[PDB]
Amino acid sequence: GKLQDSLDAGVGNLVDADLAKESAKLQSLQTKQQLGVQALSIANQSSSSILSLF
């Protein structure tokens, strides 16, 4: 019984993710994608100023 517990705990240490760091990465990447969408929206308008020349 104790050996089974040790093997299962070893599997858990081998694969399981640490959710505490995941909680910070989630919010950071949400802000990151929002900033990326904003920057791509700004970049899309580069050709709009050309019509003013004519």
Partner: protein
């Protein structure tokens, strides 16, 4: 001088406009990457140190 065959003022205006466009491009690129040193083009030495260190 007021010939129709050339227009230097438009030439300097275009030079300044392209310079400002390049500055805005690099700024929006650092906005959507979140990194002053995005690639080896930005600055090779610290970028190399960052790659090895990470």
């Amino acid at each position: 001088l007021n010939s129709i065959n050339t227009n230097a003022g438009a030439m300097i205006a275009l030079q300044n406009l392209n310079g400002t466009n390049s500055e805005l491009t690099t700024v929006q690129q650092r906005i959507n990457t979140g990194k002053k040193i995005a690639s080896a083009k930005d600055n090779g030495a610290i970028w190399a140190t960052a790659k090895n260190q990470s």
